[PDB]
Amino acid sequence: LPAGTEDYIHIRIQQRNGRKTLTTVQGIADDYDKKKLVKAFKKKFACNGTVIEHPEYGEVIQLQGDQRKNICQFLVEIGLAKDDQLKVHGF
Amino acid sequence: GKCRGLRTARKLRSHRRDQKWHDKQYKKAHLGTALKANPFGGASHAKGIVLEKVGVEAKQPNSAIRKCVRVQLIKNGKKITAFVPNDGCLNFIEENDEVLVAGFGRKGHAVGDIPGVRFKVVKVANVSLLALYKGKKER
Amino acid sequence: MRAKWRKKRMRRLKRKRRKMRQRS
RNA sequence: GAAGACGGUCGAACUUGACUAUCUAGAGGAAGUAAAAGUCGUAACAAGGUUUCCGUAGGUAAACCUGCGGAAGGAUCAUUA
RNA sequence: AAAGGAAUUGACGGAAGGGCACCACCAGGAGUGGAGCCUGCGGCUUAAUUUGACUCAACACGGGAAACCUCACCCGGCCCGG
RNA sequence: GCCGCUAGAGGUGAAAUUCUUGGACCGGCGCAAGACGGACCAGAGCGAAAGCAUUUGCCAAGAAUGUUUUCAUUAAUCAAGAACGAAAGUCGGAGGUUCGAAGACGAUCAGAUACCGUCGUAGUUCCGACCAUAAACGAUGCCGACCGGCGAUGCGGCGGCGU
RNA sequence: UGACGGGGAAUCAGGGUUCGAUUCCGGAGAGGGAGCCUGAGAAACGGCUACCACAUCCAAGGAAGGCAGCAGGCGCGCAAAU
């Protein structure tokens, strides 16, 4: 198994117009390769999303439509979790 | 254009013998697979034992909760869903009773406004629901 | 659904089914 | 002139092999058509905002997108010596 | 318990072509928008800052320029005109 | 490849990725490579349908018309069966100029792993061996008969002033 | 094949379609299969011999079985008489 993740993971969700929301993740890992786990993010959460390239930052993945809770479902289902590092910024 | 000569009776009859199978009532009543999947097996009624009482909502333009029962048949052991017809005729039924279940009136198709239910209950414990309903007999 | 892509998706489904059935 | 007995035949039945119908318990696992106040977007109908669709081949959460050949059910029945 | 075919009227278009109008531009004038002030509306506070109206078809509009009545609104009390 | 000028070329709604003082784009004379056959080209032609376009050959084949030629019903449609069948595709070989799925980048957008640009593999190209599907469309089976007109067009034949 | 065959039945304009286990004829079988005795006539079962299957009485040494005859009860059933 590869190395454990770095110190903290932040999930930020913001709004766009109508009935829609635009949700981000921040700071998963710098060590972890295969950062095209958007492909596993999109195909499990049933959402359109991608990674946009932000400098000196945590390789933000933006997904459309509200999943804060489904990230909690998926990350305890998979290896990388301690379940005290995930701070929810939902409104 | 048809084959219409004088010695051509075999072509006409072995045509119409084979294009009768594209007719749906002839295929559904003469192939034999309908009689094995039907819960009655070609009967008019079937006696069975009430498992559990359900309510099913009507289809989309109506709004009601139709009172029905889940019956398990004695004869072959399959489980059906039957509709207990009149007003207040749900209350005359205890569970684990013999009921005599007839079809709903459209011969294998399940319609009304009630989805997936084609059976209705005639009797409960050898007294019929008309006699129980009018106050002519008792339990 | 455009019927060619319904055809293509049942084509992919049958190709995966015949992949999973001849392992044994 | 009875029982029995060698042999002969007709031969039910049991024995271990097959193979082949009909129904049944099937842990999982993959699909539907309804229910229609869930979520993600708009692919189709207006030149539906990239004209649609057919055959095939590759890809992608998803409608779909792109290639090469074909059709108008097209958005032209026609455009000049 | 319809799915579909052809055809008519209508609505709609991110189609093609005409027409009208100073609630359109062009010829142009006084302006408005920047400035102090009356006044309405959005917010903010209040015990209350009552209220309807939000693109022409809201915002000097309720003929609404209210010191009491108006007067709905607040704080305290009489009153049957039960 | 050789010249001989120069600071931009390309591309787009706008741009950026790409190329360029080791000399690009444009101009000139040349060589070679592979694909392709414009304009003439039409509601015109041929083919069983798929399809088919530079010249001159050679190889067989065919509709139409003309016929006082011959045979004398040999015919129509087609279970079984077979031949061909665009493009994509698969395998073996040769070829590779351009286009171009997958892919790598750029930019448009909230997001586009789509349209829009730069480059590119497999393929497109040819010779063999497969596959037999298309909106393979006149969305209209084939043979025969009968039933109004009209003016041209392709081919073959006949008859008519003229030019 | 929820198939005994036929004379026939219910529908029916002409054509058809469907049904016929059923009182008349013809076949087949008496739980499943065999094999026989007598007799003119049987592969008889209100005859016999076994095997299979299921069942009754027993002093556990043995004995006897066959309603798809009329009535009747069990059971299966929506569904059939003294």
UniProtKB/Swiss-Prot annotation, chain A:
Tell me which UniProt keywords the record has, alphabetically: Acetylation, Cytoplasm, Initiation factor, Phosphoprotein, Protein biosynthesis
Q: List locations, semicolon-separated.
A: Cytoplasm
Q: Which GO terms describe its cellular component?
A: cytoplasm; eukaryotic 43S preinitiation complex; eukaryotic 48S preinitiation complex; multi-eIF complex; nucleus
The organism sits in which domain of life? Eukaryota
Q: Major place of localization?
A: cytoplasm
Q: Which biological processes are named by the entry's GO terms?
A: regulation of translational initiation; translational initiation
Which positions does the site annotation Binds 40S ribosomal subunit cover?
R19, K43
The GO molecular function terms of this record are: ribosomal small subunit binding; RNA binding; translation factor activity, RNA binding; translation initiation factor activity
Q: Which family does it belong to?
A: Belongs to the SUI1 family.
Tell me the function of this protein: Component of the 43S pre-initiation complex (43S PIC), which binds to the mRNA cap-proximal region, scans mRNA 5'-untranslated region, and locates the initiation codon. Together with eIF1A (EIF1AX), EIF1 facilitates scanning and is essential for start codon recognition on the basis of AUG nucleotide context and location relative to the 5'-cap.
Q: How does it assemble?
A: Component of the 43S pre-initiation complex (43S PIC), which is composed of the 40S ribosomal subunit, EIF1, eIF1A (EIF1AX), eIF3 complex, EIF5 and eIF2-GTP-initiator tRNA complex (eIF2 ternary complex). Interacts with EIF4G1; in specific 5'-UTR length and AUG context. Interacts with EIF5; which in a mutual exclusive interaction associates either with EIF1 or with EIF2S2 on a common binding site. Interacts with RENT2.
The name on file for this protein is Eukaryotic translation initiation factor 1
Whose protein is this, by species? Homo sapiens
Q: Which portion of the entire protein is included?
A: 23 to 113 of 113
Curated annotation (Swiss-Prot), chain B:
Major site of localization recorded for this protein: cytoplasm
Question: Which residue spans adopt a coiled-coil conformation according to this UniProt entry?
Answer: none
Q: Which Pfam families match?
A: Ribosom_S12_S23 (PF00164)
Which positions carry 3-hydroxyproline? Answer: P61
**Cross-referenced CDD domains, in alphabetical order?**
Ribosomal_S23
Give the record's GO CC terms: cytoplasm; cytosol; cytosolic ribosome; cytosolic small ribosomal subunit; endoplasmic reticulum; membrane; nucleolus; nucleoplasm
Fill in the PTM field for this protein: Hydroxylation at Pro-61 affects translation termination efficiency.
Keyword Nucleus appears in the UniProt entry? yes
The biological process GO terms on file are: cytoplasmic translation; maintenance of translational fidelity; ribosomal small subunit biogenesis; stress granule assembly; translation
Entry annotated with the keyword Oxidoreductase? no
| Assigned keywords, A-Z | Acetylation, Cytoplasm, Deafness, Disease variant, Dwarfism, Endoplasmic reticulum, Hydroxylation, Isopeptide bond, Nucleus, Ribonucleoprotein, Ribosomal protein, Ubl conjugation
Impact noted for substituting R66K = In BTDD; decreases hydroxylation of the protein; decreases the accuracy of translation; decreases levels of incorporation of the mutant protein into ribosomes and polysomes; patient cells become highly sensitive to oxidative stress
Q: Which residues carry this modification: N6-acetyllysine?
A: K134
InterPro entries per UniProt: NA-bd_OB-fold (IPR012340), Ribosomal_uS12 (IPR006032), Ribosomal_uS12_euk/arc (IPR005680)
Disordered: region residues: 1-25
Q: Which residues carry this modification: N6-succinyllysine?
A: K53
Basic residues compositional bias, start-end = 1-19
Q: For the cross-link Glycyl lysine isopeptide (Lys-Gly) (interchain with G-Cter in SUMO2), what are the residue positions?
A: K36
User: So what does mutating F119I actually do?
Assistant: In BTDD; decreases hydroxylation of the protein; decreases the accuracy of translation; decreases levels of incorporation of the mutant protein into polysomes; patient cells become highly sensitive to oxidative stress
Q: How does it assemble?
A: Component of the 40S small ribosomal subunit. Part of the small subunit (SSU) processome, composed of more than 70 proteins and the RNA chaperone small nucleolar RNA (snoRNA) U3.
Family per UniProt? Belongs to the universal ribosomal protein uS12 family.
Q: Per its record, how is this protein called by name?
A: Small ribosomal subunit protein uS12
**What gene codes for this chain?**
RPS23
UniProtKB/Swiss-Prot annotation, chain C:
Query: What are the boundaries of the region Disordered?
Result: 1-24
Instruction: Give yes or no: UniProt keyword Ribonucleoprotein.
Output: yes
Q: Name the keywords, alphabetized.
A: Cytoplasm, Ribonucleoprotein, Ribosomal protein
Q: Which GO terms describe its molecular function?
A: mRNA 3'-UTR binding; mRNA 5'-UTR binding; RNA binding; structural constituent of ribosome
A GO CC term attached to the entry: cytosol
Q: Where in the cell is it found?
A: Cytoplasm
Pfam families the UniProt entry points to: Ribosomal_L41
- Family matches, as InterPro entries: Ribosomal_eS32
Which GO annotations describe the biological process of this protein? cytoplasmic translation; translation
UniProt function note: Component of the small ribosomal subunit. The ribosome is a large ribonucleoprotein complex responsible for the synthesis of proteins in the cell. Interacts with the beta subunit of protein kinase CKII and stimulates phosphorylation of DNA topoisomerase II alpha by CKII.
What other note does the entry give for this protein? Answer: Initially thought to be part of the large ribosomal subunit. Crystal structures show eS32/eL41 to be a small ribosomal subunit forming a bridge at the interface of the 2 subunits.
Q: How does it assemble?
A: Component of the small ribosomal subunit.
Q: What family name appears in the similarity comment?
A: Belongs to the eukaryotic ribosomal protein eS32 family.
What name appears for this protein in its UniProt entry?
A: Small ribosomal subunit protein eS32
Q: Tell me what organism the protein belongs to.
A: Homo sapiens (Human)
Taxonomy of origin reads:
Eukaryota, Metazoa, Chordata, Craniata, Vertebrata
What is the gene name?
Answer: RPL41
